[model samples]
Target chain A: GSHMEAVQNRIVEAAERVPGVRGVIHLRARYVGQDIWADMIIGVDPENTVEQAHEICEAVQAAVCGKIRRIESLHVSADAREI
Target chain B: HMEAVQNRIVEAAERVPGVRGVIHLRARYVGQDIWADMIIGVDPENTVEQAHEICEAVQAAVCGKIRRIESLHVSADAREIGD
Candidate 1:
């Protein structure tokens, strides 16, 4: 599973580097066919609206996709980070 | 607290319908909240929307049953029969 962790960690890094991402709550990764699929929760400012959360999540998608070519799919949720 | 969350993740997911198996599970702290990611196995023949609903259900059930789980992202995949 070391290979899996390599890919999973890259996703976490890419998500965290997004402009509005305060943190990443969780990430789930697996191989579906030859491509990678991931599910993640990104923590944003508690002040962000649901709409803002959507935009940030979109940015996370862009950043991760650009960085990880094998990530065929990513499902991101935006939630409040109290800190 | 970290291990506690991981344990709850498995406990919660396994109780959800269509979540035959939970794999590639992990949880981490992002500020004050706990975020988690998991891939769940379901019947292979489920429709795409059906699978989506199942995953969503798993997410909802998990968050309600577990504390400190700020967000959870669950991806549903087809479980090979007999495995």
Candidate 2:
């Protein structure tokens, strides 16, 4: 139980560390089949293209999987909104 | 139009077993289409394997039930211990 909290923090921290990630608006972690699965809703800076959002999401996914050896899967949604 | 799709997604995900709740649902227009991001709250009493099944079921159910969403993102999280 406590371990999941730690992993959740790790995911959120790693996601925020990615460039072009304005913030991580939503983050949740689940354990599945001997590994951790993470889902994150990330906010990117406004005016970025879908391609840039895709790149940022890829970076976040890489950051999580690379930082945590047991991460089995990751899903990231990049939101670029107007002010 | 967007609200209808959101409700549909929520309802479909809720139908899946082991899915105790859903949260952090965000839907917005990205160009001509709508995109959604949501976190599924899984029952903590279940094992990781079960949680994974629940997530899979949610995705399948939502996709099968609704067809208007251009992009849909589903993420899983353990429900609070007492929840």
Candidate 3:
């Protein structure tokens, strides 16, 4: 049952690993506490350039894929902006 | 056109590790009130301009009546919502 929904905790962990990643946002799916997916908003810091965002995103992808055994697919998004 | 945008977002969002699901919001930032089109999927491919493109595609697809064309891109800052 739990496998059918998205996992937030994992996403949080992976997002934090990204260097210079200052903020993160989780956009859940339908219903309460159920996530559809998450997004890590990269800060405009020098270390968080667009390239860095891409690398961070890739890193997050690898981490989540390792933890979620049932999941065979995943997606990614990267953006650099000032808060 | 909608499919293109959707594909982009989905492709980008899913690629992120630990990311279980992703929801996309399309809107023009107007202070506290943002004009938005909530969408599912957040692939890493889609960016602010891509989101706008998706919106434009939707608008054109509907207005073109199967006999018109359109193009669009993001004009402002876009992030994962947080940070």
Candidate 4:
């Protein structure tokens, strides 16, 4: 459980570091076999484009993957404002 | 087209070390993202720690292999050992 919390905190922090990411809304992690898998949602600023959100998400993925060991999967979603 | 992705997800999940088989798997498409829910069978004799590890592996394997999953929820059920 400690490991799970560690992973969650790192991921949320990474997402929060992105410029257009308003916040990390939620994160879920699971362990299977020899790896960690994570799913997360981020709030996007009104000024940001979906493309920008994708870029931020990629950054979030890289940060989490770099900091954690055996993170074999990650999913990132954006909560965007309607036009 | 979607079925192909689903099949790939199933294949990747089954390859996880401790996953006996996938009991239930569903994916929903909303706007530009995909959300997934999956339940897998694992070895009953595994300790809680080991079972959790296996679940993480499954999440990693499936989500890593299938690039379109934007959100995922994974759960495990105990099954007969060596099945």
Candidate 5:
């Protein structure tokens, strides 16, 4: 248990640190007749460019300071309406 | 809701034998352009077959295939990516 990350709390804190991070949602999934943690759905400023999104993500990662598991900075696709 | 499916993904990923733990996973369920990424502590000693199997199990548990999972550059002993 010590090795297991408290992912839910870590995610909440990371998102909150972002200046424009408005909301964060967990992605869950079902497995072997049960549900589990999936991914994180971050809601940032719509005006934030893809690069800005990346920056926010990077900032969040740094804020964690490796206390939690590291995050992969996913590439935000272009086209505002598409997202 | 997508949350229902997200839970399943978590369960599926955890089922993988060599999966030590999950770090961060992100899913873009907003629009046509979909993407997901996962950071996990894999049993590096396992062969490629094992890694692919983990990915396959996750794919089956999720609503979609494992499009991409970029490996992390650094490894740590942290419990959560805490702030």
Candidate 6:
């Protein structure tokens, strides 16, 4: 894999680390200036409360954007885990 | 109050049937009403119309549930399958 692929994979991995994130369905890393502005769609439990769901997304966003200085901004969305 | 409003938007938006989760929400009062934008996730393979329908429903769900003026920007993204 190329260096970009490795970076993207690590982001996916970081998202998966969130407690409520069951999986990641999509990831797109775009460059904004010198930093990475990424988009991700994650899967979580359908029964999760809205606050909980939002919290999970924030956690995943933090897991990627906060921990990694390369991330300019990380945007995340969530869906129910495949049932 | 910023966080409070974001949670309310998330609380109402995620209740829509097709909306799996809401994230990256930012809201600020503008001219007496709160203007906001958020991203929502739906299951994979949902057609654009279906995804758009969900977006409409989310708008209604949030606006109906919360009392405010101004507008909301909702972006829809699809779920992913991963190991």
Best by lDDT: 1
Candidate 3 residue-wise lDDT, A7-83, digit = tens:
65655665566665555543332323433443333333332433345566677667766775443445555444445
lDDT of 5 by residue, A1-83 (tens): 22224655655666567675655544332222222223344555445444455466566556544444334332221111113
Write model 6 residue lDDT over B11-70, tens digit each, in one string: 888779987787457677887798887778776566444566788899888888788837
lDDT of each: 0.77, 0.72, 0.43, 0.71, 0.45, 0.74
The interface RMSD values of the models, given in order, are 12.4, 14.4, 7.8, 17.6, 15.5, 9.1
TM-score between predicted and true chain B, model 4: 0.87
Angstrom error of the Cα, residue B75, model 1: value is 14
DockQ of 5: 0.03
Write model 4 residue lDDT over A4-56, tens digit each, in one string. Answer: 77767777776677666678776778899778887776666434543455577
Q: What are the chain B TM-scores of all models?
A: 0.88, 0.76, 0.28, 0.87, 0.49, 0.86
lDDT of 1 by residue, B1-83 (tens): 77777777888878888777786687878898888877777675664445567788889988998867898877655565476
Q: Is candidate 3 or candidate 6 better by TM-score?
A: 6
**Model 5 error, position B81 (Å):** 32
How many clashes in each structure? 1, 0, 33, 10, 17, 1
| DockQ of predictions, in order shown | 0.04, 0.04, 0.07, 0.03, 0.03, 0.06
How much of the true contact map at the interface does candidate 6 reproduce, as a fraction?
Answer: 0.02
Docking class of 4: incorrect
TM-score of each: 0.51, 0.50, 0.38, 0.47, 0.33, 0.52
**Cα lDDT tens digits for candidate 1, A17-71:** 8998988887878898778988787777655544555678889999999988888
- TM-score-wise, the better of 1 and 4 is 1
lDDT of candidate 4 over B10-38, digit per residue (tens) = 89988888788887777888876689877
Per-residue C-alpha lDDT of model 2 across residues B1-83, encoded as one tens digit per residue:
77788888888888787777787688888887677767777654544345546667887888777766677766555466363
C-alpha positional error of residue B58 in candidate 5 after TM-score superposition, expressed in Å = 22
- Cα lDDT of candidate 1 equals 0.77
